[PDB]
Amino acid sequence: KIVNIGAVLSTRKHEQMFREAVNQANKRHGSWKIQLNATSVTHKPNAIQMALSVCEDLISSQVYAILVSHPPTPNDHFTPTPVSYTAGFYRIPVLGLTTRMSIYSDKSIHLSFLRTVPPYSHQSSVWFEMMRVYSWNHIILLVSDDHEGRAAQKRLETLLEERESKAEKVLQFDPGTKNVTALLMEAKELEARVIILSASEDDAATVYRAAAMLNMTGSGYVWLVGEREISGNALRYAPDGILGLQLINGKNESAHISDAVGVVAQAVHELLEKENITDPPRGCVGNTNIWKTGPLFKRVLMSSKYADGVTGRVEFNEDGDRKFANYSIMNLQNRKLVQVGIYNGTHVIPNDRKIIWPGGETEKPRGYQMSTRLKIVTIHQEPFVYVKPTLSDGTCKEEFTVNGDPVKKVICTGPNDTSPGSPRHTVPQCCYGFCIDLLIKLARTMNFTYEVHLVADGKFGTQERVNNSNKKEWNGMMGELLSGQADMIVAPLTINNERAQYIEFSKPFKYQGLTILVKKRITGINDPRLRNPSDKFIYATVKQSSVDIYFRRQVELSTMYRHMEKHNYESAAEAIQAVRDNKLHAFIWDSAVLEFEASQKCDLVTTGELFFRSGFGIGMRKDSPWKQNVSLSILKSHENGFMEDLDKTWVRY
Amino acid sequence: TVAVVFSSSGPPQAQFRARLTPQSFLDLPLEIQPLTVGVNTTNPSSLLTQICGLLGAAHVHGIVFEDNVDTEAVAQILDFISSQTHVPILSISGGSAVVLTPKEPGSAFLQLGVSLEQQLQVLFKVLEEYDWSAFAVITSLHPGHALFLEGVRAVADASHVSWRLLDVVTLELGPGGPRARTQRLLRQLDAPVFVAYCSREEAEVLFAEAAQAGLVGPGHVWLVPNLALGSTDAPPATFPVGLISVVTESWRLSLRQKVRDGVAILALGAHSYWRQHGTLPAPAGDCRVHPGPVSPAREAFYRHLLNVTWEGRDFSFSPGGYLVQPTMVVIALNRHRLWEMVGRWEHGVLYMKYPVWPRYSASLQPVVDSRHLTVATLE
Numbered sequence A: 001k002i003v004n005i006g007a008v009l010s011t012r013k014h015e016q017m018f019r020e021a022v023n024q025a026n027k028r029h030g031s032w033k034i035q036l037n038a039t040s041v042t043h044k045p046n047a048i049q050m051a052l053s054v055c056e057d058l059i060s061s062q063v064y065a066i067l068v069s070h071p072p073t074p075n076d077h078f079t080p081t082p083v084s085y086t087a088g089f090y091r092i093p094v095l096g097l098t099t100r101m102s103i104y105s106d107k108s109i110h111l112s113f114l115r116t117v118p119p120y121s122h123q124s125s126v127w128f129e130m131m132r133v134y135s136w137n138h139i140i141l142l143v144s145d146d147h148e149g150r151a152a153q154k155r156l157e158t159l160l161e162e163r164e165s166k167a168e169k170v171l172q173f174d175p176g177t178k179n180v181t182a183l184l185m186e187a188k189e190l191e192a193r194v195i196i197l198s199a200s201e202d203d204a205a206t207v208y209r210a211a212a213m214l215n216m217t218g219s220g221y222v223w224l225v226g227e228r229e230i231s232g233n234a235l236r237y238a239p240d241g242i243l244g245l246q247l248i249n250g251k252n253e254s255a256h257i258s259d260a261v262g263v264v265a266q267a268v269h270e271l272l273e274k275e276n277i278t279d280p281p282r283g284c285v286g287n288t289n290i291w292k293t294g295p296l297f298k299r300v301l302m303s304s305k306y307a308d309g310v311t312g313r314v315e316f317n318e319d320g321d322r323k324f325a326n327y328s329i330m331n332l333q334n335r336k337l338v339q340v341g342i343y344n345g346t347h348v349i350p351n352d353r354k355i356i357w358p359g360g361e362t363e364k365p366r367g368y369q370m371s372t373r374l375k376i377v378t379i380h381q382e383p384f385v386y387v388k389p390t391l392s393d394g395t396c397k398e399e400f401t402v403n404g405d406p407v408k409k410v411i412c413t414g415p416n417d418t419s420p421g422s423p424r425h426t427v428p429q430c431c432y433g434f435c436i437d438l439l440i441k442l443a444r445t446m447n448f449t450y451e452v453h454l455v456a457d458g459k460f461g462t463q464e465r466v467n468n469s470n471k472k473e474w475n476g477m478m479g480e481l482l483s484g485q486a487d488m489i490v491a492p493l494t495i496n497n498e499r500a501q502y503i504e505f506s507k508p509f510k511y512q513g514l515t516i517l518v519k520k521r522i523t524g525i526n527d528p529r530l531r532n533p534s535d536k537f538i539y540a541t542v543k544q545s546s547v548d549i550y551f552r553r554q555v556e557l558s559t560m561y562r563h564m565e566k567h568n569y570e571s572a573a574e575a576i577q578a579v580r581d582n583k584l585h586a587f588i589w590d591s592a593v594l595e596f597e598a599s600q601k602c603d604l605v606t607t608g609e610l611f612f613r614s615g616f617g618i619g620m621r622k623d624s625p626w627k628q629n630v631s632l633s634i635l636k637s638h639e640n641g642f643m644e645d646l647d648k649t650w651v652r653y
Numbered sequence B: 001t002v003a004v005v006f007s008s009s010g011p012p013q014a015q016f017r018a019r020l021t022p023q024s025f026l027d028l029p030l031e032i033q034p035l036t037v038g039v040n041t042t043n044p045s046s047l048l049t050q051i052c053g054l055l056g057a058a059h060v061h062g063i064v065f066e067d068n069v070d071t072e073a074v075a076q077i078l079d080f081i082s083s084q085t086h087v088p089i090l091s092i093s094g095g096s097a098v099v100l101t102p103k104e105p106g107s108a109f110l111q112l113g114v115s116l117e118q119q120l121q122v123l124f125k126v127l128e129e130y131d132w133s134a135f136a137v138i139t140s141l142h143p144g145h146a147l148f149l150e151g152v153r154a155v156a157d158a159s160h161v162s163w164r165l166l167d168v169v170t171l172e173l174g175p176g177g178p179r180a181r182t183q184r185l186l187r188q189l190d191a192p193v194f195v196a197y198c199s200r201e202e203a204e205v206l207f208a209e210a211a212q213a214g215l216v217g218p219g220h221v222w223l224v225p226n227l228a229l230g231s232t233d234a235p236p237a238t239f240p241v242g243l244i245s246v247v248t249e250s251w252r253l254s255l256r257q258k259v260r261d262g263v264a265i266l267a268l269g270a271h272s273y274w275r276q277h278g279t280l281p282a283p284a285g286d287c288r289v290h291p292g293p294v295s296p297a298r299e300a301f302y303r304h305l306l307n308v309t310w311e312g313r314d315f316s317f318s319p320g321g322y323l324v325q326p327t328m329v330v331i332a333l334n335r336h337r338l339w340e341m342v343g344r345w346e347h348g349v350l351y352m353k354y355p356v357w358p359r360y361s362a363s364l365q366p367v368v369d370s371r372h373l374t375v376a377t378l379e
């Protein structure tokens, strides 16, 4: 009826604290049934030697549980790991009090472990709550690449996709590195006014100083971080205001030992009542077995109710944390932290204080930082967008259209390089045509300044399976749009199922189908010459196109596309030349381009009627404000007839 | 120089010492002289002392491990050793040869096995050749269940075929407790194909319960990963014939073959190395002192060690301490209560010993049953 517990600490007086606590436990609970002993040893620097000494001390006593805290030494990870591992091999439970690393939360590596303080991870949940209270919707995520960072982020997108609004671009940078200017330069283009951070204490000053250098710390943008970056900031690199948080009894190491001793003393009676009390004793040579009922002991210990709140009621979560806790919100003004609000279990309660933001404006700033500049991408296209070299001066020739008007032109950067063989060179050129006129009409309709730059690789865009990987990756202009380079596309884009999942194309402005070119008895849907292939009448088309997917969604036309994939061009002009050259027999895509080309370049004809129906339309990233108004206005323009008028100027000649 | 250790097999250990007594195999392109160590029992203090004292006694460069009766929770100690003394190790077999996903940051463990995702893709590849598609997923309350369920859910949504999934069930599989809640629930199921992931004792208890409540007849099929099945050389009782699992290659080989393979791996690494730098990497070893920030020379050595070849196989290690592009074999329980090969897997294509799945009656005589009509034709 003598139960022994152990503990590893560093404060020589804290052993007296444990002795007083167990004396109080004996004086409070128990009645001539069981008495409880105690003993503890001080930490030693040599980690392996500490493990050997601890296991020998366990050999010298019949211990049941181990309790450890944070020694003042900065080598934080060194202290908990050896005793934890040497305990795992026996399944003897261990409870930590002042270690908040995240790697110990994975039950796979540490078999039995319980933390009495919530880890750094749930800062994400309280951050979500703080976002809820202050009506902030779009958040940029700036996290490091460490294991704690990925765990914290993962919890964050789980609790955010609970609302399914999704987060903006998440940026990952390597730990222990400087000159992080590139990441912030990339972030600066995007539109956001709330930024969130979580990283090492030393890296905090580094990432902080660049913000001051790049003046991102001005008004509008607002900061908020966890306690990890609170301390090192004021140390050597002055802050500019940050919302934060801390725990009530952080680093006290006095209440926690009392609470843990109380809970274990409460648990031992229930364990003795279980009618299967198998004594461990200290077999360190030959006793290669697990203390037979450790799993049940851990299961009932995790279920232990709060013994006595005293400083605070303590329970245990399913993963092994303490649910239903509280936090104190602090602000950074004039280099003196002040409490401003108190966290409840779920909600947050402000308490008669004044909040200050870095700009100096007393009122709560409005987020979402609405923008006015827009990026646009376009591709080479025969009847819609002409691209021509600029003149020697820097602009290009300002000619005059026949019908008493000038053809409008815009300056377009472009890559100036064709095919993957040619390296990137770049040169500013000028672009003009149908779609450019449609765009400049929008410039008259509302207020925004376009900066047109052409596509990278000249492919319209498809979905491709990454070679030996888990997830498929987009390619081409659609991929560039989805990445975040631009926010609109004005090009002859076909609408199809594969695109409608992500980008919402609205209100088609010109209907078109599919035709086939021959040089001058073929049926587009099904003909004996084309359904059954031979050495003659070779069918081919431009690779990485919508027609590729459309033919990939067939059965015997699937075999047609299979033998068609053996041949592929990289541009329409090559096919147009080959049709005259008679090297290529057949060519298949959108009706309007081929019709205009046949009208202009004679001696070529299209065979068969349209066997398909679709529409061209602009495309935007999902949940973008511009969509409703652009769709509303395009219909009014179409009803007026300017779109009809432009046609005779550019389709019928 | 390199050292080797043997563990937990008495009468075999005599043959182990006899095979250690040779000067060398005289094949490896190196002049390293091995050394052997033998530990009576597997215990923390014993292993700690016998490893670091031996390491610091005679200035060695690398060490390789050898397995035991396959009791769990042993790889963590070696991982801590690698973290502390910054010396590369290598496991070859046994329970220690199980993937330990979130390894220590600065360590280099290099335990060969199969990650759970790779260990799982093969069951889906073999479940499509016959196209049963039932998916009654049974998981116990085990530490590794969270990753398993997430992986299977992720794979189900990005696969080739529809893969209709019936349901998912988790149950308490403790050594003692009231069975009724799980027993009534388990019989409330209907699916021709089961996949289950659990431990050895959990396997025993679940399989006995299922046999009790009539789910072990000729109509159903069980799939389990490599975490189960324990010894791989001792067939336990209560196992219904027809269990399917996937294990890595060289399982039927000898311990001498495995240790020779490890020696060859390290020797070929060194052989590729000396050409780059001119000499063997400096041996860093100190049990007591424990110095060492990030060292570029040993890091470059570890980098150069990751890709090897020859001996009719491959060992390409990922950043995770596990090999990729693996070669494993499908295993099953024969009609005479004995393990036998079923199917190979080489470079993303799958094979099979039989064109149809036999299934067995109570006696040795199988039931041809209805359907599965045999149809012939010619070109």
Ligand SMILES: *[C@@H]1O[C@H](CO)[C@@H](O[C@@H]2O[C@H](CO)[C@@H](O)[C@H](O)[C@H]2NC(C)=O)[C@H](O)[C@H]1NC(C)=O
Pocket: A002, A004, A037, A038, A039, A040, A060, A061
């Ligand atoms: C309670 O634990 C203490 C440990 O501090 C026991 O005291 C002995 O302490 C010496 C070193 O100071 C150890 O070498 C002995 O092994 C300890 N004794 C035992 C039995 O382990 C004390 O004896 C314990 N008392 C009870 C009733 O358990």
Ligand SMILES: *[C@@H]1O[C@H](CO)[C@@H](O[C@@H]2O[C@H](CO)[C@@H](O)[C@H](O)[C@H]2NC(C)=O)[C@H](O)[C@H]1NC(C)=O
Pocket: A625, A626, A628, A629
């Ligand atoms: C769509 O366009 C209409 C054009 O009238 C916008 O309505 C104006 O919106 C601005 C601010 O958004 C207000 O200052 C004006 O008073 C509104 N005009 C009228 C007549 O009420 C509308 O806001 C636009 N919406 C989107 C999502 O772009």
Ligand SMILES: *[C@@H]1O[C@H](CO)[C@@H](O[C@@H]2O[C@H](CO)[C@@H](O)[C@H](O)[C@H]2NC(C)=O)[C@H](O)[C@H]1NC(C)=O
Pocket: B272, B276, B304, B307
């Ligand atoms: C394994 O991969 C590494 C890649 O680093 C190869 O090692 C290097 O290969 C480069 C190729 O130019 C050589 O120049 C270096 O001298 C090698 N060492 C370094 C710096 O890594 C290694 O060769 C590959 N495996 C094989 C087949 O040797």
